[PDB]
Amino acid sequence: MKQLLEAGVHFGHQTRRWNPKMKKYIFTERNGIYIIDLQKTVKKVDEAFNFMREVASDNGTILFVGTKKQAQESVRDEAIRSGQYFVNHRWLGGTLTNFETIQKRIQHLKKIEKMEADGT
RNA sequence: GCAUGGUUGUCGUCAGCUCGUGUCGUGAGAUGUUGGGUUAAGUCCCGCAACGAGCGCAACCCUUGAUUUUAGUUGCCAGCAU
Ligand SMILES: [Mg+2]
Ligand SMILES: [Mg+2]
Ligand SMILES: [Mg+2]
Ligand SMILES: [Mg+2]
Ligand SMILES: [Mg+2]
Ligand SMILES: [Mg+2]
Ligand SMILES: [Mg+2]
Ligand SMILES: [Mg+2]
Ligand SMILES: [Mg+2]
Ligand SMILES: [Mg+2]
Ligand SMILES: [Mg+2]
Ligand SMILES: [Mg+2]
Numbered sequence: 001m002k003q004l005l006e007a008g009v010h011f012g013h014q015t016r017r018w019n020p021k022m023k024k025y026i027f028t029e030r031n032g033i034y035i036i037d038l039q040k041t042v043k044k045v046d047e048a049f050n051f052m053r054e055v056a057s058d059n060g061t062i063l064f065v066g067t068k069k070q071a072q073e074s075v076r077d078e079a080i081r082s083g084q085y086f087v088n089h090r091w092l093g094g095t096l097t098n099f100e101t102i103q104k105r106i107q108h109l110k111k112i113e114k115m116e117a118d119g120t
Numbered sequence: 121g122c123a124u125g126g127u128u129g130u131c132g133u134c135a136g137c138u139c140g141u142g143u144c145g146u147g148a149g150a151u152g153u154u155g156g157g158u159u160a161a162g163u164c165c166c167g168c169a170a171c172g173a174g175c176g177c178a179a180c181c182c183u184u185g186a187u188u189u190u191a192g193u194u195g196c197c198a199g200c201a202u
Contacts, residue, residue, distance in 0.1 A: 093152095093169030098142050101171050 002042045012036055063087060 012018075012026070012034035027035035055062070064075040064086035072088045079086030087095070095102050 090168090092171065094142050094171065098171060101141060105171075 002045075003038050006038065006041075010036070010038065061085060065091065067091065 011030065014032040015029065015034065016032070018034065025036055025040060027037045029035070062084045064079045064084065066072060066075040066086075066088060067090060075086045076088050092102070
């Protein structure tokens with residue numbers, strides 16, 4: 001349910017393209033591809049589970065960020081179901097530091113949308 | 121006219137000149153404005169740590185090509201007499 005459940009395609013990247021900081025997270029070395037300690041994955045996903053417990057115990061706003069082309073259906077669908085927020089296309093430079101300009105553009109689209117339907 | 125105001129030529133109606141808020145730089149600064157396409161054009165698109173805006177481009181002005189209403193003299197003459 002936590003170790004054997006995933007199985008399938010849960011391997012790493014090629015040996016040439018790797019980060020040394022991950023030496024503790026590698027199980028074995030396959031042909032180029034590395035192998036990741038699934039035993040570890042369980043503990044740390046449990047800590048992520050508990051951290052999101054603490055975060056979302058109160059009414060909190062969260063963002064699902066994902067652009068990798070094998071990601072842009074999920075983040076959208078569980079963000080819609082969970083009612084939280086997501087960015088699935090490219091990340092515009094400064095959506096948080098320039099939150100003011102981004103929300104001006106949001107207000108622009110929203111106002112012209114009420115123009116289209118609620119207005120003339 | 122080499123002390124000036126005003127008026128004009130020229131590149132050339134060529135496509136440029138900048139700002140606000142963010143980020144990257146010890147700093148002067150940088151990015152946007154670089155790259156690939158497309159356009160008459162910084163015209164637009166796709167990329168991309170930038171998101172937008174302003175003066176220049178374009179539009180508003182004049183004329184020409186089609187047509188409707190209003191108006192028939194000094195304009196026009198079709199069906200009618202001269
Ligand atoms: Mg003289
Ligand atoms: Mg003089
Ligand atoms: Mg002179
Ligand atoms: Mg002289
Ligand atoms: Mg002079
Ligand atoms: Mg002289
Ligand atoms: Mg020049
Ligand atoms: Mg120049
Ligand atoms: Mg320039
Ligand atoms: Mg440059
Ligand atoms: Mg322009
Ligand atoms: Mg013009």
